[model samples]
Target: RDQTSYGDEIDKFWLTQYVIHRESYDFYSVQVDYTAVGLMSTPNVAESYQSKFKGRNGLDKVLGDSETTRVKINSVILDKPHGVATIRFTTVRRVRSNPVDDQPQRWIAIMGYEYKSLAMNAEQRYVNPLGFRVTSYRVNPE
Candidate 1:
């Protein structure tokens, strides 16, 4: 069931304030190192993760091994000796206006996308209702 206290006007206003006025924020960065295996890199890898978890299933399939994609990790390695160097995946979440305008249409302004990275390691794991996997982590700001 769809439930929200605010109407379209307030929602639209906040969209403009957050999306148009707000700048990008770095969500997290992941460094994958290939010890003895190859690494694979792709833009769609993260997108696929989003679809599998945050898609229609919602939290149902948010955390699971099946929901996870495994790469050889060899492709990311530049040197075969020590394996590949660190494959850095730095993700940033930002809301960019679709049309460049002082005041954009309600639909356009509200339609924005958020970007983020995949969770790596045991500490960075989450489970959805359907046992799907999502990204969760512990941050050490100090």
Candidate 2:
């Protein structure tokens, strides 16, 4: 069955967790933990994230918010073991607050890459950093 598992709105908003502090930190960073729905916890799962920004959704899609009001991702770093894939990157961000409830929030854009694992994907399984307790599963046939 085809399921989004996580709503795009949530997925779109979740990236806001990565914050960029130019004074202390040069690049953006993902400080929050994430777990995709349906994915089990395992050692093989690769974890990474980025800040979302203007044009990320598409070109000409001007950010509804102003430049100073958007989140900016600076940089991302990852540690990968042998036979594992790692990802890292950075971007910008903006802080915002709701009107009715007045809840504060941040947003940004992210850019990163994934490592290709042939042997690992064939032997290990995907894991969830938030929910799963570390398990393995078979790779999906393409």
Candidate 3:
């Protein structure tokens, strides 16, 4: 973990990427919702998401192409020595290529992670070059 590029903007990048992949739905990019989430999460935390779409992919079914969701970071705070972080964000909702009339929803994501040296192949190496993995993750509505 000492070798990590954590405690910097890249930390935001890793969690930001994870938040989008976990919460978003895309007709074209649906499969990545599962794979990308799994790749960034440790097995325990990843199990939660695996249960979310393991047998059959979803979020796609619920939102479909007609409606969508994406998260915008409100703020990210991290404690490097403690290996913990929190990301507060807002979900922008849309329908048929336009913003939803409803006000966006707010949520907080709590994550605990650590960096291990790469145990990745070509594809994992490309996206998660630093081996930053979310050992624990949860989202609470605000």
State the lDDT of candidate 3 residue by residue for 1-142, as single tens digits: 4343466677778888888888776667867667878788888888877775544555566556887667788988887777778989898767876744447899999988777885579988887778877888889998
What TM-score, over all chains together, does every model reach?
0.17, 0.19, 0.83
- Largest TM-score belongs to which candidate? 3
Candidate 3: segments with Cα more than 4 A from true spot:
1-5, 61-63, 97-101
State model 3's lDDT. 0.77
Please provide, for model 2 over 44-126, each residue's C-alpha lDDT reduced to its tens digit, 9 standing for 90 to 100.
42321112222457211343332222333332223222111111223223323433322334322222212222233421344
Q: In angstroms, give how far residue 76 of model 1 lies from its true place.
A: 8.8
Give the worst 10-residue stretch by lDDT in candidate 3.
52-61
* Tens digits of lDDT, candidate 1, 1-142: 1122134343333222222211212212112111100111123433443343366564334322222121111111122232112221222322333333122211111122121234444432321111111111111111
Best by lDDT: 3
lDDT of 1: 0.24
Ranking of candidates on lDDT, top first: 3, 2, 1
Instruction: Give the lowest summed-lDDT range of ten residues in model 2.
Output: 22-31
Supply the global lDDT for candidate 2.
Answer: 0.25
Model 3 TM-score on a 0 to 1 scale: 0.83
Q: Candidate 1 or 2, higher TM-score?
A: 2
Runs of candidate 2 with Cα error greater than 4 angstroms are 1-3, 18-142
